[PDB]
Amino acid sequence: VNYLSGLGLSRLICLPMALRAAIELNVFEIIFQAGPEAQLSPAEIVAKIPTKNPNAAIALDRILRMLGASSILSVTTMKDGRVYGLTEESRCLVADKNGVSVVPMLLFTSDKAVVESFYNIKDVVLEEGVIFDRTHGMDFFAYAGKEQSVNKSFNQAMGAGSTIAFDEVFKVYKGFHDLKELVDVGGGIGTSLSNIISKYPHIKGINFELPHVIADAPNYPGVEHIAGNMFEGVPNAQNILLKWVLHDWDDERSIKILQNCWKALPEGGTVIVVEFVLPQILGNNAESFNALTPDLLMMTLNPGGKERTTTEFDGLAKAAGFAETKFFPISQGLHVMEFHKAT
Amino acid sequence: VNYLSGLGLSRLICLPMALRAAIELNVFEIIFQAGPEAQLSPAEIVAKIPTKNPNAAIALDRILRMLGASSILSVTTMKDGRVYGLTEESRCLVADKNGVSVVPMLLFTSDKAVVESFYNIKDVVLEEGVIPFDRTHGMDFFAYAGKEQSVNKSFNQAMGAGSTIAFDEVFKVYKGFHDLKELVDVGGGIGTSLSNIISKYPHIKGINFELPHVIADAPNYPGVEHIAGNMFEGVPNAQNILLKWVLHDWDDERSIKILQNCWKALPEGGTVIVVEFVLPQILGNNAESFNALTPDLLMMTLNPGGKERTTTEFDGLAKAAGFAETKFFPISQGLHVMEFHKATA
Ligand SMILES: Nc1ncnc2c1ncn2[C@@H]1O[C@H](CSCC[C@H](N)C(=O)O)[C@@H](O)[C@H]1O
Ligand SMILES: Nc1ncnc2c1ncn2[C@@H]1O[C@H](CSCC[C@H](N)C(=O)O)[C@@H](O)[C@H]1O
Numbered sequence: 001v002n003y004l005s006g007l008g009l010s011r012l013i014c015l016p017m018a019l020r021a022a023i024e025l026n027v028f029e030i031i032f033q034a035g036p037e038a039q040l041s042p043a044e045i046v047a048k049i050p051t052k053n054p055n056a057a058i059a060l061d062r063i064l065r066m067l068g069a070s071s072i073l074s075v076t077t078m079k080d081g082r083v084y085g086l087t088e089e090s091r092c093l094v095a096d097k098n099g100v101s102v103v104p105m106l107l108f109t110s111d112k113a114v115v116e117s118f119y120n121i122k123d124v125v126l127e128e129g130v131i132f133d134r135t136h137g138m139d140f141f142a143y144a145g146k147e148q149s150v151n152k153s154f155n156q157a158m159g160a161g162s163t164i165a166f167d168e169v170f171k172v173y174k175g176f177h178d179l180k181e182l183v184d185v186g187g188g189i190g191t192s193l194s195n196i197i198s199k200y201p202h203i204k205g206i207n208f209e210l211p212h213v214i215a216d217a218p219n220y221p222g223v224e225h226i227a228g229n230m231f232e233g234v235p236n237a238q239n240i241l242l243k244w245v246l247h248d249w250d251d252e253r254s255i256k257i258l259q260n261c262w263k264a265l266p267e268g269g270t271v272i273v274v275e276f277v278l279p280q281i282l283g284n285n286a287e288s289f290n291a292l293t294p295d296l297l298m299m300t301l302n303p304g305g306k307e308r309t310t311t312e313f314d315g316l317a318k319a320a321g322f323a324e325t326k327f328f329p330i331s332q333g334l335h336v337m338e339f340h341k342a343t
Numbered sequence: 344v345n346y347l348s349g350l351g352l353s354r355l356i357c358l359p360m361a362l363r364a365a366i367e368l369n370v371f372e373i374i375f376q377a378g379p380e381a382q383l384s385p386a387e388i389v390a391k392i393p394t395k396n397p398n399a400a401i402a403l404d405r406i407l408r409m410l411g412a413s414s415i416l417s418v419t420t421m422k423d424g425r426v427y428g429l430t431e432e433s434r435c436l437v438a439d440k441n442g443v444s445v446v447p448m449l450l451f452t453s454d455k456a457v458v459e460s461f462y463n464i465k466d467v468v469l470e471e472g473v474i475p476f477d478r479t480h481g482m483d484f485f486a487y488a489g490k491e492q493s494v495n496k497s498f499n500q501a502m503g504a505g506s507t508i509a510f511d512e513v514f515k516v517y518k519g520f521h522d523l524k525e526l527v528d529v530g531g532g533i534g535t536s537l538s539n540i541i542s543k544y545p546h547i548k549g550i551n552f553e554l555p556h557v558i559a560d561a562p563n564y565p566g567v568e569h570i571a572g573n574m575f576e577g578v579p580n581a582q583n584i585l586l587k588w589v590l591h592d593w594d595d596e597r598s599i600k601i602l603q604n605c606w607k608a609l610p611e612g613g614t615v616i617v618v619e620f621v622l623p624q625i626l627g628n629n630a631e632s633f634n635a636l637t638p639d640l641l642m643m644t645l646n647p648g649g650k651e652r653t654t655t656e657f658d659g660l661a662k663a664a665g666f667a668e669t670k671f672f673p674i675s676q677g678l679h680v681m682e683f684h685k686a687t688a
Contacts, residue, residue: 003508005630005676006435006445007637010452012362014640016355017461024465046468053471060468062643062650066636069628077625092349102349109353115458118360122367125389125403128396164346281420282408289351292409296357299405306405332348 011066018066020110023103025049027064028093031073031086039076039085100163108157109297113143113150117300124303132301140301145212155213158244159191165243165274166195168331175272175328175338176200182272183208183237185230185261186245193241194220208235230257234264243274247294250304251316258320262341271322271339278307279333287333313337354413361409363453366446368392368403371436374416374429382419382428443507451501452641456480456487456494460644467647475644484645489556499560502588503535509587509618509678510539517672517680519616520544526616527552527581529574529605530589533561537585541566552579574601578608587618591638594648595660602664606685615666615683622651623677631677657681 022028030048031040042057042064049056064084068075074085086094095101108114117135124130132140144151176182176196181204184193193205197220205223207214214225226235231253234240240261246254261271278291291307298305308316314325322339329335365371373391374383385400385407392399407427411418417428429437438444451457460479467473476484488495520526520540527550528537537549541564549567551558558569570579575597578584584605590598605615622639626632635651642649652660658669666683673679 001434002431003435003439003443003445004512004678005634006432007448007505007508008630008633009362009432009435009445009449010641011633011637012359013453013458013461014637016359017458017464017644018640019352019355020462021465021468025468049468051469053469055471056468059643059647062639063464063468065626066640069626069632069636071628075626082626088345089349089352091344092346092352094344096344096346100346102346102352105350106352110356112459112462115356115360116455118357119363119455121360121406122364125364125368125392125399125406126394126396128398161350164350168347282412282418282425284412284414286348286351288412289354290348292412293351293354293357295405296361296409297353299402300360303402334347 011070014066015070015072016110018063019072020107021063022067023093023106025060025063027060027084028086028090029095031084032094037085039074039083041081041083045084098163100160102160102164104153104156104160105158108153111150111153113147114297114300121296121300124299131303141210145210151212151216155189155216158188162188162191162243163195165330165334166192166199168334169274169336170199172330173328173336175270175336176203179203179239181238182206182241183235183239183264184241184243185234185257187241187243189213189217190220190223190225192243193223196241197222206235206237230260232260234260237261237264237269238266239269240265240271241274242271244294246273246313246316247275247298247307248302248305250306253304254316255319258316258322258339261339262321265341267341268343269341271317273313273335273337273339275313275335275337276307276333277313277329277335278309280309290333310335354409357409358413358415359453361406362415363450364406365410366436366449368406370403370407370427371429371433372438374427375437380428382417382426384424384426388427441507443504445504445508447497447500447504448502451497454494454497456491457641457645464640464644467643473647475647477646485554489554495556495560499533499557502532506532506535506587507539510536512675512678513618513680514539514543516674519614519672519680519682520547523547523583525582526550526585527579527583527608528585528587529578529601531585531587533557534564534567534569536587537567538564540585550579550581574604576604578604581605581608581613582610583613584609584615585618586615588638590617590657590660591619591642591651592646592649594650595663597648598660599664602660602666602683605683606665609685611685612687613685615661617657617679617681617683619657619679619681620651620677621657621673621679622653624653634677654679654681 030045042061046056067073072090074087076083092102117132183206185208187207190207197203197205207225211227214227276291279287282288295307317325317339323342324340326338373388385404389399410416415433419426435445460476463475525548529552531551534551541547551569555571558571620635622635639651661669661683668684670682
């Protein structure tokens with residue numbers, strides 16, 4: 001009945017593009033640097049933006065306006081204009097003391113190559129077996145090996161997410177305690193292993209990745225980088241880490257990965273899986289969005305991939321030869337899961 | 344700081360693309376066709392989708408559950424699986440008795456050409472005098488519509504649906520069209536606005552004044568004569584003029600030029616009738632603010648000179664263009680009708 005304000009549903013595409021602009025203009029760091037609970041005018045923010053455009057503050061106010069009404073920024077309207085401060089939702093856009101924030105992930109997820117592929121997600125409903133591989137011509141990981149800007153943006157997105165995930169993991173999960181050697185299958189640029197190793201310096205880390213990812217991985221002490229193809233085989237390992245890998249693949253390919261892991265482990269070895277877990281009852285909450293967001297990104301980037309429930313992860317482990325599963329909830333849907341090879 | 348769930352801010356880009364998919368798959372009409380409070384499973388929705396893909400329901404569920412978590416649809420988990428129903432926010436996606444919905448507008452504003460230009464709105468901050476669309480595409484938006492027929496059609500249908508929606512609300516409140524005999528719609532789109540007015544007031548003779556490529560796309564409406572031209576060079580002589588969602592496309596200088604040409608085309612006592620959303624002075628998380636901020640951001644990307652305006656700014660434009668009398672008619676949730684009156688003796 002309210003068609004008039006239903007036209008405002010166009011805000012759903014405006015908001016993420018306004019946010020990307022504000023991130024690229026470094027708005028949130030400028031606000032945070034001004035003081036603990038600073039509220040800055042657009043002109044005060046523009047003072048820290050490298051531009052000599054006199055109309056920059058008027059233009060910036062149009063972007064921050066939308067973010068404030070959307071609760072990404074606080075907006076207080078005063079007589080000379082609006083002033084903007086951080087909110088609980090935008091704190092994560094400011095780097096921590098090690099220089100890590102969600103920004104690399106947010107820029108990747110809204111990058112051109114991803115948003116372009118989003119126009120074809122209805123084809124996964126309409127066309128059996130069709131797959132990015134439409135929109136672009138190869139699979140996402142091959143495309144990354146070919147487009148270095150995408151490789152870098154994705155690798156940095158996953159590295160930032162890795163620091164963020166393991167900072168949460170280490171408050172709850174102590175299973176890395178007794179380990180001596182850990183092979184990270186698809187471990188990205190090695191950030192996960194570096195985080196683990198810095199916490200447990202006795203761990204020998206081996207990062208197992210595609211050549212075009214390894215080529216741009218920095219050298220962390222205690223980490224050796226090995227190139228390979230996890231579908232053909234995984235290096236012999238006392239224990240294996242599998243973080244944000246299984247959710248890239250359908251059941252058949254996930255079982256193949258896990259079976260290769262099983263073959264590389266000795267009796268008693270463990271695969272440590274780190275994923276978000278799809279809740280049984282979905283709703284408007286952090287645990288739901290934390291799984292539904294990567295699930296939709298998978299549908300456009302590697303639709304074989306999908307997020308899974310605890311029951312589905314146990315089913316993958318048992319189908320791959322693992323006898324015992326153990327589930328360790330971390331935070332808001334993030335889980336560590338242990339797949340134990342029998343002793 | 345909850346960095347972990349802050350990664351979920353990626354949902355902001357997923358949500359409009361999920362909604363666009365659901366629109367293109369006709370999900371909302373399918374649910375409505377089952378009943379007012381119908382709640383359908385993905386398998387039942389897929390039954391009305393032309394596909395032979397046995398995995399369609401599982402795939403559709405991945406899109407729907409995101410819309411349900413974001414309150415665009417209801418998502419209820421039953422023993423057999425999830426079912427989905429319409430909400431107050433998604434009723435506007437179902438066409439009315441005449442086949443009119445917000446869908447044409449929603450498909451245009453998430454169109455590839457619009458979204459691609461969105462990547463350069465930061466350039467309006469950084470560079471004096473820059474073009475998000477004119478940079479992204481090499482010419483201004485209206486010329487680009489002249490060149491790409493699919494964009495011409497998507498935009499014209501978006502504006503046409505928005506016109507019916509807007510005037511359905513206008514006619515509940517505004518009586519100023521009652522005694523008019525002639526109305527020239529400057530930049531009137533494909534003429535839907537005049538058709539809505541004339542059908543409620545059959546004595547009004549309408550003149551739709553538009554660019555050639557818009558006229559070529561327009562149907563024949565009774566009582567509406569189409570005239571091609573360029574409003575910046577001049578406007579046809581008119582007893583009264585309609586200006587709906589035109590001024591917000593242009594900066595103050597060009598808005599004044601349009602209004603001055605309107606003044607020159609009017610006799611004494613003639614009126615410009617302006618229909619726009621009005622930017623409120625104090626903004627918040629509400630319809631009236633989003634109803635202005637949303638087209639404002641679209642204008643920032645499509646023709647950055649364009650901007651949404653306060654009542655004080657509209658009055659200033661009218662006065663700078665030779666209209667000394669202004670009247671403001673709030674319609675609903677920020678939409679206003681405004682009358683700029685040319686003086687009589
Ligand atoms: N066939 C293959 N063999 C080894 N790694 C592969 C692979 N196919 C894809 N990958 C890698 O799997 C990774 C999944 S993204 C996850 C990266 C990292 N584990 C993290 O949690 O941040 C990508 O880095 C990709 O390069
Ligand atoms: N120089 C010009 N002369 C005449 N019309 C123009 C113009 N430049 C842009 N326009 C038209 O102005 C319109 C603005 S969109 C608004 C259309 C219509 N009044 C409605 O409310 O739905 C477009 O249709 C565009 O074709």
